[PDB]
């Protein structure tokens, strides 16, 4: 089923000669690939600004709303140096920040986004009060909601993202560890309660579950949890990697489809999505994560299998974003690039820039947030200009 959902892939796959003209031996783009890719940015820019221009004032949210344009002008200031795109971010934090709700703590989809984004721009442009008040603000935001779920879009771990960007950003421990800490503690201990409940633990020592499905994927499900849970980041100990993270990744891999892919949820048996929210493009983190944390080739393997099923079944009729599109599939080849130095894999993200460079020519669906970070054109921006210098390419608001 997952054929009805993707465009037939009409590139060859990976040989050293149709490679050359993409990147060098060393793996650095071409300056002619280099300059396409750039030629694409500032045209798809121009066509972001002017949509940009009916987007729902209201929404500030980094997912759909303005802390995402803002994240995007940032990592332009980051790849280019042009000043231009620091005042344009600038323009968006402010906007963002009359948007706050205070109804969700996340990056993505709460007000951590806003003041997350607002902190590290101020910061930025030397402006230390202002930044310092973010932080605060962000500090204190965990108080509003208690018996969050655990995950990615409206979790702790999505908090837990805002607090680690301020610190990668910043270059300096601005959140205190022992914050982090203390909300990795309650998700393992959520994880452990919920699967002691359910009698999962013989199988799976943790278990976790959003809107009543045990989801399995990198938005709202298990990959995005364990993918954080292995993060050096969060200081998990040695003892609970092995004795609760590890045998619940297992239980993960074994849900795996014969194709390689991955259901949206624990018991649901379409094979149908392959987006970075359900299915093998946010599955593939967890795997990549494993294999360098625990060192056993079967993640690895899995990984390749997930690189496959996306090269066959990525370039998606739903579009070219992050969340469900071909720019989010495009991140699942350079994780694994990043992880094996293997060029195969940054061949293919390659191609799949090629397919955004034709952006709008497939007649692909018009997105709910056409402009925005994770659904629209924003996150199409993203993915080019990361690709500019493939080794320090991250998933936006997710990879680590
Ligand atoms: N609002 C989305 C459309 C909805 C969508 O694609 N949702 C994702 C989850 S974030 C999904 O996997 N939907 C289920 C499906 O495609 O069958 C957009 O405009 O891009
Ligand atoms: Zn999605």
């Given at each position: 089923?997952?054929?009805?959902?993707?465009?037939?892939?009409?590139?060859?796959?990976?040989?050293?000669?149709?490679?050359?003209?993409?990147?060098?031996?060393?793996?650095?783009?071409?300056?002619?690939?280099?300059?396409?890719?750039?030629?694409?940015?500032?045209?798809?820019?121009?066509?972001?600004?002017?949509?940009?221009?009916?987007?729902?004032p209201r929404d500030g949210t980094g997912?759909?709303g303005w802390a995402g344009?803002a994240?995007?002008?940032?990592?332009?200031?980051?790849?280019?140096?042009?000043?231009?795109?620091?005042?344009?971010?600038?323009?968006y934090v402010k906007q963002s920040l009359n948007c706050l709700t205070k109804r969700s703590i996340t990056f993505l989809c709460g007000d951590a986004g806003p003041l997350a984004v607002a902190a590290?721009?101020?910061?930025?442009?030397?402006?230390?009060?202002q930044?310092?008040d973010c932080?605060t603000r962000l500090?204190h935001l965990?108080k509003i909601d208690?018996?969050?779920?655990?995950?990615?879009?409206?979790?702790?771990?999505?908090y837990?993202?805002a607090?680690?960007?301020?610190?990668?950003?910043?270059?300096?421990?601005?959140?205190?560890?022992?914050?982090?800490?203390?909300?990795?503690?309650?998700?393992?201990?959520?994880?452990?309660?919920?699967?002691?409940?359910?009698?999962?633990?013989?199988?799976?020592?943790?278990?976790?579950?959003?809107?009543?499905?045990?989801?399995?994927?990198?938005?709202?499900?298990?990959?995005?949890?364990?993918?954080?849970?292995?993060?050096?980041?969060?200081?998990?100990?040695?003892?609970?990697?092995?004795?609760?993270?590890?045998?619940?990744?297992?239980?993960?891999?074994?849900?795996?489809?014969?194709?390689?892919?991955?259901?949206?949820?624990?018991?649901?048996?379409?094979?149908?999505?392959?987006?970075?929210?359900?299915?093998?493009?946010?599955?593939?983190?967890?795997?990549?994560?494993?294999?360098?944390?625990?060192?056993?080739?079967?993640?690895?393997?899995?990984?390749?299998?997930?690189?496959?099923?996306?090269?066959?079944?990525?370039?998606?009729?739903?579009?070219?974003?992050?969340?469900?599109?071909?720019?989010?599939?495009?991140?699942?080849?350079?994780?694994?690039?990043?992880?094996?130095?293997?060029?195969?894999?940054?061949?293919?993200?390659?191609?799949?820039?090629?397919?955004?460079?034709?952006?709008?020519?497939?007649?692909?669906?018009?997105?709910?947030?056409?402009?925005?970070?994770?659904?629209?054109?924003?996150?199409?921006?993203?993915?080019?200009?990361?690709?500019?210098?493939?080794?320090?390419?991250?998933?936006?608001?997710?990879?680590?």
């Amino acid at each position: 089923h997952m054929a009805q959902r993707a465009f037939p892939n009409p590139y060859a796959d990976y040989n050293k000669s149709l490679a050359e003209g993409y990147f060098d031996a060393a793996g650095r783009l071409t300056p002619e690939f280099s300059q396409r890719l750039t030629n694409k940015i500032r045209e798809l820019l121009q066509q972001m600004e002017r949509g940009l221009k009916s987007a729902d004032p209201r929404d500030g949210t980094g997912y759909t709303g303005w802390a995402g344009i803002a994240v995007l002008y940032l990592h332009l200031y980051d790849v280019f140096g042009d000043p231009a795109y620091l005042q344009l971010a600038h323009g968006y934090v402010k906007q963002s920040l009359n948007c706050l709700t205070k109804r969700s703590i996340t990056f993505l989809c709460g007000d951590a986004g806003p003041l997350a984004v607002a902190a590290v721009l101020y910061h930025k442009m030397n402006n230390e009060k202002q930044a310092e008040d973010c932080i605060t603000r962000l500090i204190h935001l965990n108080k509003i909601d208690p018996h969050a779920p655990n995950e990615m879009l409206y979790g702790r771990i999505g908090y837990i993202y805002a607090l680690l960007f301020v610190n990668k950003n910043f270059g300096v421990e601005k959140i205190p560890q022992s914050h982090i800490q203390q909300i990795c503690e309650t998700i393992l201990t959520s994880g452990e309660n919920l699967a002691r409940k359910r009698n999962f633990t013989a199988k799976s020592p943790l278990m976790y579950e959003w809107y009543q499905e045990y989801y399995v994927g990198a938005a709202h499900g298990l990959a995005g949890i364990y993918y954080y849970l292995m993060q050096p980041s969060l200081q998990v100990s040695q003892g609970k990697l092995h004795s609760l993270v590890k045998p619940s990744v297992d239980y993960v891999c074994q849900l795996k489809f014969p194709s390689g892919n991955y259901p949206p949820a624990i018991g649901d048996n379409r094979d149908l999505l392959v987006h970075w929210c359900h299915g093998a493009p946010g599955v593939i983190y967890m795997l990549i994560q494993a294999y360098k944390v625990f060192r056993e080739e079967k993640y690895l393997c899995d990984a390749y299998q997930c690189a496959d099923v996306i090269w066959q079944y990525g370039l998606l009729k739903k579009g070219y974003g992050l969340c469900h599109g071909s720019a989010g599939n495009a991140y699942a080849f350079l994780t694994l690039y990043n992880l094996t130095q293997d060029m195969k894999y940054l061949y293919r993200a390659c191609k799949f820039a090629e397919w955004c460079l034709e952006y709008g020519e497939h007649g692909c669906r018009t997105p709910d947030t056409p402009f925005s970070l994770f659904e629209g054109m924003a996150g199409t921006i993203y993915f080019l200009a990361d690709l500019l210098v493939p080794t320090k390419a991250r998933f936006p608001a997710f990879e680590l």
